[PDB]
Symmetry: C2
Subunit: 505 residues, 2 copies
């Protein structure tokens, strides 16, 4: 834990291959475009969805433009001067939730109001940058091995529940009048509103089901190999385009806002000044949410890097955890100054990128994908054709796609499985702890984990205290270290909380 030792080691290790990182990427030629576009499509659409969420939750202060710009700039900077280019940066849901809490707090306080929300966010980002600098200097990344499976799967499931909640919220609001829209327009009559709601339901469910089916196209029997691969890789964008076109079918026989489309404005049509006007008391109070955003980033960046640098990939280059965290602090400071939400490592974008590069490790794919994500801002008129129902369907799609490889979800299903029926579980691929651990212990572990998850999810509903859930997430580390061994017996915990995904036939 010697200060500056880790950063120096990572810089030394990554400074002997920089020219190699660039040359190998240039040597790959035009063949490097396929992974680049794959990751770009995996990254942009969730960013646009988070931007629409922020727009509906921030009264239009933040939109898809800000999220796209932040993602793009942070990605280019990380690719050029970052330590681990395989890591993919972008705006994530927890950041959206934090900013929603901060906006709700600011709106209710006249001293700040909606006008100083971005300035208060910038001060929060300054504080977060300071804490990340401290954590990176003190070598707190040397203990990332304690972010065991339990916390990772609990956080993943919580994010999935938030995604589903947002999808349901959007589908419900499709039946209502927007808060900041003219109420006299024809499209907002009760009949047209009901029609828009049902059309949104149709489009969202179609998108969801078609994408889920397409995710397993390479396993299909029909079609050519290249077509099957193209589908399995780009079903989400392809289905988005298809259902947009479907939405455009009755365009001639209905009003203009039927179905509703992206509310994000077209930009074609710095806040350091206001950060000086914020009262000192609120500048100090920004310490609170900054600590929790810093905790979230310290967790997510490290976990995403660990996933992207799995030993099975046979990577021949070292890791840059500490320098990556320091650069994340710098990026957070810069984004707060610019008036955009900060970006951090995302999952499974980084492992998917590494798999697509399987390894051809270089800094060109990330740079290019961030460049096109930023250029999508210039294509805002085209993106504005996408209905919001498709975005809600995509939210539900991610919520459902967070489940497959999650052991907590499988253990919940086992808990809800009938006693006379577990042979069916044993008839297919299953985890080792099913055989090597008694069912009662698995049930107790799953019940404790589910209670913790539901407590965190309920806390998220509290107006002000709901900004504390990262603290609960981080409390799982010492709990797993100290308390669980008291109530559990060694190998049971090791199998139920193994750092490796163990499967049996």
């Amino acid at each position: 834990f010697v200060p500056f030792e880790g950063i120096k080691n990572d810089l030394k290790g990554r400074l002997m291959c920089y020219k190699q990182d660039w040359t190998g990427g240039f040597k790959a030629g035009f063949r490097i475009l396929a992974p680049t576009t794959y990751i770009f499509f995996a990254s942009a659409i969730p960013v646009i969805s988070f931007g629409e969420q922020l727009e509906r939750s921030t009264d239009g202060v933040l939109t898809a433009v800000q999220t796209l710009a932040s993602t793009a700039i942070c990605g280019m900077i990380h690719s050029i001067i970052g330590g681990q280019p395989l890591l993919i940066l972008g705006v994530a849901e927890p950041t959206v939730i934090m900013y929603t809490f901060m906006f709700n707090f600011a709106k209710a306080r006249p001293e700040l109001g909606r006008d100083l929300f971005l300035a208060w966010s910038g001060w929060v980002c300054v504080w977060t940058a300071l804490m990340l600098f401290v954590l990176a200097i003190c070598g707190a990344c040397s203990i990332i091995n304690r972010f065991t499976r339990v916390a990772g799967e609990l956080f993943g499931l919580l994010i999935a529940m938030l995604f589903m909640q947002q999808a349901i919220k959007g589908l419900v609001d499709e039946f209502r009048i927007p808060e900041r829209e003219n109420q006299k327009l024809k499209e907002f009559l009760p009949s047209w509103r009901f029609a828009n709601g049902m059309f949104a339901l149709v489009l969202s469910f179609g998108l969801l089901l078609t994408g889920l089916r397409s995710r397993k196209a390479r396993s299909w029997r029909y079609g050519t190999g290249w077509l099957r691969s193209l589908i399995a890789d780009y079903g989400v964008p392809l289905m988005v385009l298809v259902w947009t076109g479907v939405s455009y079918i009755p365009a001639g026989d209905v009003p203009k806002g039927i179905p509703r489309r992206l509310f994000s404005p077209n930009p074609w049509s710095t806040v350091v000044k206001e950060m000086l006007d914020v009262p000192i008391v609120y500048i100090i109070g920004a310490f609170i949410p900054a600590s929790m955003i810093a905790v979230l980033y310290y967790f997510d960046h490290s976990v995403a890097s660990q996933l992207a640098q799995q030993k099975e990939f046979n990577l021949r280059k070292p890791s840059s955890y500490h320098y990556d965290l320091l650069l994340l602090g710098f990026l957070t400071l810069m984004c707060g100054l610019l008036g955009v939400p900060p970006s951090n490592g995302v999952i499974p974008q980084s492992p998917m990128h590494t798999k697509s590069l399987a390894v051809k490790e270089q800094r060109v794919s990330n740079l290019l994908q961030s460049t096109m994500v930023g250029g999508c801002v210039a294509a805002m008129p085209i993106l504005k054709m996408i209905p919001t129902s498709v975005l809600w369907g995509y939210f539900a799609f991610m919520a459902i796609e967070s489940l497959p490889g999650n052991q907590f979800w499988e253990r919940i299903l086992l808990l809800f499985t009938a006693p006379s029926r577990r042979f069916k579980v044993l008839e297919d691929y299953h985890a080792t702890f099913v055989e090597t651990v008694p069912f009662k212990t698995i049930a107790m572990f799953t019940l404790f984990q589910t209670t913790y998850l539901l407590i965190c999810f309920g806390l998220t509903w509290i107006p002000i205290a709901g900004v504390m859930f990262p603290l609960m997430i981080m409390f799982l580390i010492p709990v797993r270290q100290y308390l669980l061994p008291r109530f559990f017996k060694g190998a049971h915990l090791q199998d139920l909380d193994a750092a490796e995904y163990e499967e049996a036939p």
Copy 2:
């Protein structure tokens, strides 16, 4: 082919067990209700759907009331005095198509008009009864072994295509104004019409997907055994009820006819006289459609009986093909006199009934199920709560459910399968001809069968000549006998057109 020999033999064989047929049913006790209700639910809903189809195609002359009454009465009469009680009688789609053609013909001719449509149908039914009497007396049922697989699967696929066409027609018409409804009502405004259309889409697709998923509930892992069996048996009615309730959710915030519901009237709120007023020329011309209805019935009754009396069931009682055909002629005459469409054997209602009775062969289950089908007429107000979108979804459901066990559909899929990909077909359960027959011969056979099917389907679109498709169906017998052996080599035809469903692991 000695006249009256077959009928005498069947009557003799079935007259030594009649008292046994009744006593065994009475001895079963209340346990006989489960198969009874299962078959009643399998029979009623398609009958209601066909009634709605006739209502929309007959300008309200025929509705679900007539179809239900015909099904009920014919079923009770067959159970009491029929030869094969396991056979289930009801109104089928080909009868609906024939009556639609006859109504379209009558409407365009002023001498008949809509007022004499039922009288002309009664004369057609009299002719059909005479032809069925002739066929049963001449022993034409001694050659039912020539109704090979090719014709059966072609007819099944044609009926499936008709079902899907009707479902699409209904879903499209949900977006429009009914022909015989007040156009000034609020529910028929463009906005409300669009809303009703999209709600219909939602309900129909939900019903379809949920029913398809529920059909394999016994294979699920979740839930109790009794619950899984109940779902796998009654998913269709359960899903109908669920989606009706869903349709009732926004009832308070929308107009009265949103969503649209059954147009069949509530009866609570004989045509021999008019058959004398029909011109003699049309009485003679009724010979034409009568012959084809007779051909359809001679095919379907015999095939359904053969399926319900499969040797695997180990039935200890003889068959009554000829007497069954004679009784069908009598029932057709009676129904034509009463002014209702005739009923005939249906598939897979009879095999499903036999399976549910697996065999406890008796006349009580059919009698009871027909009695409750008839009593459903008294429950017309309750049935009128069901939206039409659910019925269109059920149409699509039957269309899709006609495919699984059909070898023609599998061979079409194989034809559209990629050459480098047939190992995937070989990786699962498959038919024997896949291994024992070259692919080129299978492709030629499938192409010929598909061309024949498409020709029949296109003929069905002709206004007047579309009533000739049963003749094409019957032409497959002599074709298979004489022409195919010229172009095919023995064992190839035997495997591709085997009377037994041969499967390989």
